[PDB]
Description:
Blueprint: E1 2-7, E2 13-18, E3 23-31, E4 36-40, E5 48-58, E6 64-68, E7 87-94, E8 97-103, E9 112-116, E10 124-126, H1 130-133, H2 148-152, H3 155-158, H4 168-176, E11 191-194, E12 199-203
Parallel strand pairs: 1-12
Antiparallel strand pairs: 1-4, 2-3, 2-5, 5-6, 5-7, 7-8, 8-11, 9-10, 9-12
Amino acid sequence: ATFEIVNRCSYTVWAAASKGDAALDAGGRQLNSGESWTINVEPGTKGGKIWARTDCYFDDSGSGICKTGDCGGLLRCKRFGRPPTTLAEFSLNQYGKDYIDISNIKGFNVPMDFSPTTRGCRGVRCAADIVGQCPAKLKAPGGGCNDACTVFQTSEYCCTTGKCGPTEYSRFFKRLCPDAFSYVLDKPTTVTCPGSSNYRVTFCPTA
């Protein structure tokens, strides 16, 4: 399946794509403002994610650091990135269908639209100014808006027992972006697409 990843932000981002234990495609690449990078993701990929990383420095071997979404200091991501990261999440060819969503469970760094480029389903979007409006206690000094689990490490925010409810913090992400997951047990905003759909992930889709 093809994912065209487009940076419409006015700043550079380093896109990242992983399924947690392996890179998807090359795993990461710089995208200056306006650039598009098309990756191929294997059919059957389960629990894949794409995100943006901000304010990165890499040396000539592809090692260094990002202020948000850093994946073990690598340009080419093999593992998930460090919060806060707005996440495009997808599982492809799961009994005939693809499933997509955007999640703020790991916080928010860059606004995102995640849409099919092929027929048969709708896109999802979390493009509100969550960083500018972020509650004081969730602000990441490194840049971005952390989720409450990352900041406070409780069973309630991390949904460790499987029994959590919404919280004042989750309701903040959910108010700004109703169409993304705000906590682990949020009412699902997952979209069912035809198996083998193709997609586009657009950073800063409205600015």
